[PDB]
Design a protein around this ligand. Structure first.
Ligand SMILES: O=C(O)CNC(=O)CCCP(=O)(O)OCc1ccc([N+](=O)[O-])cc1
Lengths: 219, 222
């Protein structure tokens, strides 16, 4: 099968600036009828893919002409003259000149925005959960940028690494930030054996880490 | 108006078979090729096969020969894809697509995609989730705004549907992607409202898990 290679694997562009993605095929995509069947798709977060361009450079309807495609033989490029917040997502090139049809690996386009520090929140276990003998301590780290962040759990000053469940959202198109959830689960009896719980976030927006914490005492 | 309506998410046992449907509307069914595409959580797209409902003529990617079987029902305008000998690596989202390439013309018409059918191949059993309210004790924001949460844990299979106040509360909410741990999922969501809204008024987390016929509502109280 024809291998389709895309580069870069990921790109961070600021709104208003140009961008371009490259796609390389292992074999010429020039068909014997003189047509080159290379298309470009975009798949926005939580959506089905959707073509933007067919036959190397023809644009589909409903598509703004900020997007242009070009290339020939084995080399192709998608160019965005001016990036908008809506461009966020995964881009793919596909070839239909050779059977079976093969897709490129994908290129994630992320919007580069000004650095934003996380708003951190901490929650103790719910009475309802404790009643089942379990205890989950949750920490939300919302609306931050860049995406690289590090959170540490500490029980009475010591670092706990086992029992952590993290989850990150994808970049929000509305504000270009990411959010993250970190849940530390323990048994009810182990929970009641400690005093302070802390969630620490290390992120580029500061040299001293954000710390949200609570003491379980009584009442 | 072209619409490709795909069947619901499926929980299937290994070795078993699934028949996925793609009901179409708004165009002459027998006139266009329907393609099937696979997407496995790895930003990867793979072409499986295509069928011309007018003649029943089908083309298969050799990787899927034997595995997939396309059929089309001209009366109901529904295309189908049967997957057999399922194994865990077959778990993914499968799309039916009215791609738009007209062979005779060698030109294109707009592509229309189905919403996708997520297939989970597992022998894990269906499990209802436990829904816990998350009200602040220290981490909160406190002054000006406050953030509440909802923890949905221990369920199988995906998906679960989570809303706040039936969906009337949509701004300021972040629902985090479910994470599977030991054949069970965990999902959480946060909602930030002003200090004047809550506790003054009611804020509930609505959780639904159709796989288990579960529908629970948890009010976030101080
Ligand atoms: O079949 C062949 O061998 C020769 N090639 C052709 O006849 C033309 C194929 C054209 P094209 O429609 O671009 O096929 C590629 C192609 C088809 C479907 C698809 N999809 O995502 O649904 C993605 C890509």
């Amino acid at each position: 099968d024809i291998v389709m290679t895309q580069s870069p694997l990921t790109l961070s562009v600021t709104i208003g600036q140009p961008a371009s993605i490259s796609c390389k095929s292992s074999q010429s995509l020039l068909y014997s009828n003189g047509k080159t069947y290379l298309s470009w798709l975009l798949q926005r977060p939580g959506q089905s893919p959707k073509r933007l361009i067919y036959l190397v450079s023809k644009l589909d309807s409903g598509v703004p002409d900020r997007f242009t495609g070009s290339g020939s033989g084995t080399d192709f490029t998608l160019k965005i003259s001016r990036v908008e917040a809506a461009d966020l997502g995964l881009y793919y090139c596909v070839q239909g000149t050779h059977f079976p049809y093969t897709f490129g690996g994908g290129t994630k386009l992320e919007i580069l925005r000004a650095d934003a520090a996380p708003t951190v929140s901490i929650f103790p276990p719910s009475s309802e959960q404790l009643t089942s003998g379990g205890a989950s301590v949750v920490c939300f780290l919302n609306n931050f940028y860049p995406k690289d962040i590090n959170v540490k759990w500490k029980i009475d000053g010591s670092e706990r690494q086992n029992g952590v469940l993290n989850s990150w959202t994808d970049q929000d198109s509305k504000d270009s930030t990411y959010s993250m959830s970190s849940t530390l689960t323990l048994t009810k009896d182990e929970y009641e054996r400690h005093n302070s719980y802390t969630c620490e976030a290390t992120h580029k927006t500061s040299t001293s880490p954000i710390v949200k914490s609570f003491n379980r005492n009584e009442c | 108006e072209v619409k490709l309506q795909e069947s619901g998410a499926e929980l299937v046992r290994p070795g078993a078979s699934v028949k996925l449907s793609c009901k179409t509307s708004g165009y002459i069914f027998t006139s266009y090729w329907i393609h099937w595409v696979k997407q496995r959580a790895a930003a990867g797209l793979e072409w499986i096969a295509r069928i011309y409902p007018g003649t029943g003529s089908s083309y298969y990617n050799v990787k899927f020969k034997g595995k997939a079987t396309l059929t089309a029902d001209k009366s109901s305008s529904t295309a189908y894809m049967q997957l057999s000998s399922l194994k865990s690596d077959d778990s993914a989202v499968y799309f039916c697509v009215r791609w738009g390439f007209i062979p005779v013309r060698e030109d294109y018409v707009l592509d229309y995609w189905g919403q996708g059918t997520l297939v989970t191949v597992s022998s894990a059993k269906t499990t209802a989730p436990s829904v816990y309210p998350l009200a602040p004790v220290c981490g909160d924001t406190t002054g000006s705004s406050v953030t509440l949460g909802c923890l949905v844990k221990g369920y199988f299979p995906e998906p679960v549907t989570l809303t706040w106040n039936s969906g009337s509360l949509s701004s300021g909410v972040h629902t985090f992607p479910a994470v599977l741990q030991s054949d069970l999922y965990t999902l959480s969501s946060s909602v930030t409202v002003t200090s004047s809204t809550w506790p003054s008024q009611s804020i509930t987390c609505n959780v639904a898990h159709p796989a288990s016929s579960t529908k629970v509502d948890k009010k976030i109280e101080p």
